[PDB]
């Protein structure tokens, strides 16, 4: 068609084309453990022709842990099970990188290590839901307990928990890592002055607020190499109830200007939540895209002419397609021809087991 099918260099990889699957959670993985499993194997699989497929949300601990089915990379046995899928999607010649969370305060107590509250930046309920299972294995949706704030001296874990979910992603085989800094999960949590009412030197003013993400960034490209590191960022609008406060576009220049320095490999922007949201300017994405300079990923509602409109404009580089990729595994191949989508099914995108997952059928 036109830029979408050219290829791209990211970081330490080259994509063949521009057509990116965003990180998706299925809730599909084994309990106990939190473990990948040969299923989610063949779903990657089916995938592989993507430019670069972003895996779904994965806990860098078990404190992490925000619903049930979500899977870690923490455990030998996930890191094993992690190898596997990675070694399917390079057998077919794809590229694929995990993204790293922490829940935060969007978790329930009965997920948590001994039961006990999820943690944040201030003691503050996300006031949302999130999925566990029942007793037959099914995902139900129940109210986020409250969290307690870290403790000063509690960061530092925090950062060497991501640090060493870096050197794990490493082992599997994962081509690169996504920070997960969107969203309204613990990243986000601390920059945005809605869900963090801090007095120390993680609260307050934007430089406040981004100490956290900027002290992991530094750690993980310590760790590996910044040419490995891409970010997720959802920093105009509100996302999951966590809006990014009065000076929402000053503060993220700011924060894309000090990732900047870093050197790291992309920027993946979430540009509005499922609900919707208002759209960037073309002024913004061009004050972006001159503090940046590896690619930049756009995502959130995209069409194929939106993507080619603002690649050909020079404004982004990828765009990352969330729930056309749950429902079209070759979505590359249709999007090249021209092709009729397969119709998405949502009940099935939560927990369950094949149907709805590796059912869709290629052309
Ligand atoms: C079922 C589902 C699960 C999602 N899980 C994640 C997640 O694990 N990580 C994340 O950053 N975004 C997540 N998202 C957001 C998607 O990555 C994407 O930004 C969003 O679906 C909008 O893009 P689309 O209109 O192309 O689907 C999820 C979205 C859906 C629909
Ligand atoms: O539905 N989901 O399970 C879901 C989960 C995650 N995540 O990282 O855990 C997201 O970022 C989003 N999201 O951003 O929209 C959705």
């Known amino acids: ?3 979408l099918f050219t290829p791209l260099k990211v970081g330490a990889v080259t994509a063949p084309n521009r057509v990116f699957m965003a990180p998706l959670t ?10 990948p499993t040969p299923l989610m194997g063949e779903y990657y699989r089916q995938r592989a022709s993507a430019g670069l497929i972003i895996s779904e949300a994965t806990q860098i601990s078990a404190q992490a842990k925000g619903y049930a089915g979500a899977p870690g990379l923490h455990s030998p046995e ?5 190898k596997k899928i990675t070694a399917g999607v ?3 010649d794809g590229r694929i990188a995990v993204q790293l969370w922490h829940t935060g305060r969007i978790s329930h107590s009965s997920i948590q290590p001994g039961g006990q509250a999820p943690v944040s930046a201030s003691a503050l309920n996300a006031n949302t839901r999130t999925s566990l299972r029942d007793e037959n294995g099914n995902a139900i949706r129940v109210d986020t307990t409250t969290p307690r704030a870290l403790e000063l001296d509690e960061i530092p874990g925090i950062v060497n928990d991501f640090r060493q979910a870096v050197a794990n992603a490493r082992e599997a085989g994962f081509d690169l890592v996504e920070l997960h800094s969107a969203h309204g999960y613990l990243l986000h949590q601390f920059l945005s002055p809605s869900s963090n009412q801090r007095t120390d030197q993680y609260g307050g003013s934007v430089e406040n607020r981004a100490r956290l993400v900027l002290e992991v960034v530094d750690a993980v490209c310590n760790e590996w190499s910044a040419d490995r590191i891409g970010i997720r960022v ?14 929402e576009e000053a503060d993220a220049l700011y924060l894309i200007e000090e990732l900047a320095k870093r050197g790291i490999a992309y920027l993946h922007m979430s540009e509005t939540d499922l609900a919707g949201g208002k759209p960037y300017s073309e002024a913004f994405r061009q004050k972006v895209r001159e503090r940046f300079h590896g690619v930049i990923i756009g995502a959130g509602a995209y069409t194929a002419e939106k993507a080619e409109d603002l690649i050909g404009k020079g404004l982004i580089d990828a765009v990352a397609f969330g729930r056309d990729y749950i429902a079209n595994p070759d979505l590359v191949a249709r999007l090249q021809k021209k092709a009729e989508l397969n119709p998405q099914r949502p009940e099935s995108f939560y927990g369950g087991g094949a149907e709805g997952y590796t059912d869709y059928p290629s052309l």
Request: glycine residues 8%.
């Open 1 to 3: 068609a036109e830029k």
């Open 26 to 35: 299925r809730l599909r993985s084994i309990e106990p453990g939190d473990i």
């Open 78 to 82: 996930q890191i094993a099970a992690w």
């Open 90 to 92: 390079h057998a077919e």
């Open 234 to 247: 959802s920093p105009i609008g509100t996302f999951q109830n966590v809006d990014n406060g009065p000076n």
